[PDB]
């Protein structure tokens, strides 16, 4: 497919402050969103129907992530905790305590027995899902940790930071295996592994996305043209149809690039504030996007490819 043809299907209203993160459940049925309003909301992925509000954090939430079972959710909050939730009941099952400042980012491993978190306290923590105990505290960075993500089998973690670094960690040992550096050292605002685990996609606050072979320390692709100088905006690989890179942007648009050619293939217009977060549906050509305070909505878009 030359280009996708994403078109607006639903606008989901409900959050009372800026939205921070949206994530589709692994089985595709649900979208979860988090907000500065201290709430998590669950929505139907296909009809955009509000399902429920999940509450309990004492301050704003910066990120949410789903277990492989599509029922457990973890949230990362400014109240210095993460919470694990049973989405079917909406109950908090446990509170993960240990970070000394805002928890900014979180993720389950594929096995879904561990959670990784990054914090303004400059550490990465690895948590036991069953006991709620902190297993390891990694002295990962020298400034706030903007993203943390497990690779395809959970053996590795990638972390990014305002300190300008991306680091690859061995999960089992907590050892740093690789540090990626840029001579001009821009803050790294987001990172994640490619679906195949071989690459990392890293956002820096100089309006640039970069695809790296981290083992070789080699940058393979750069995606530009969007606006990203201020916020930690999520980016994604879209793999259900055409192979795309998808990101939010500080000009209120969703950008979509051809992964190989690096060309912008679509820009999705409709939000009225910074698109802080986007997510790609696991099986369908569906994107969820979410925006800041002037907007406060989540949009669902659908493409033929």
């Amino acid at each position: 497919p030359v280009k996708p043809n994403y078109a607006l299907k639903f606008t989901l209203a409900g959050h009372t402050k800026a939205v921070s993160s949206v994530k589709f459940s692994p089985n595709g049925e649900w979208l979860a969103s988090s907000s500065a309003d201290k709430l998590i909301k669950i929505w139907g992925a296909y009809d955009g129907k509000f399902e429920k509000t999940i509450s309990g954090h004492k301050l704003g939430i910066s990120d949410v992530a789903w277990s492989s079972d599509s029922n457990l959710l973890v949230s990362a909050s400014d109240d210095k905790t993460l919470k694990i939730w049973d989405v079917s009941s909406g109950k908090c099952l446990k509170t993960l305590k240990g970070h000394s400042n805002y928890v900014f980012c979180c993720n389950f491993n594929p096995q879904s027995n561990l959670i990784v978190s990054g914090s303004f306290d400059e550490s990465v923590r690895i948590w036991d899902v069953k006991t709620g105990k902190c297993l390891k505290t990694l002295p990962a960075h020298s400034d706030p940790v903007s993203a943390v993500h497990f690779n395809r089998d959970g053996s590795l973690i990638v972390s990014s930071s305002y300190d300008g670094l991306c680091r690859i960690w061995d999960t089992a040992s907590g050892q740093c295996l690789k540090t990626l550096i840029d001579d001009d050292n821009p803050p790294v605002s987001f990172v994640k592994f490619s679906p195949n685990g071989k690459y990392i996609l890293a956002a820096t606050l100089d309006n640039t996305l970069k695809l790296w072979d981290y083992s070789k320390g080699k940058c393979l692709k750069t995606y530009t043209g969007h606006k990203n100088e201020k916020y930690c905006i999520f980016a994604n690989f879209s793999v259900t149809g055409g192979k795309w890179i998808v990101s939010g942007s500080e000009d209120n648009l969703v950008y979509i690039w051809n992964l190989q050619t690096k060309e912008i293939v679509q820009k999705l217009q409709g939000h009225t504030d910074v698109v802080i977060s986007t997510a790609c549906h696991p099986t369908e050509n569906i994107i969820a996007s979410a925006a800041l305070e002037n907007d406060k909505t989540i949009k669902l878009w659908k493409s033929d490819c």
Binding site: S20, P187, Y231, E293
Partner: peptide, 9 residues
């Protein structure tokens, strides 16, 4: 925090 700007240039 994510909804606020917290980074150096």
């Amino acid at each position: 925090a994510r909804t606020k700007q917290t980074a150096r240039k």
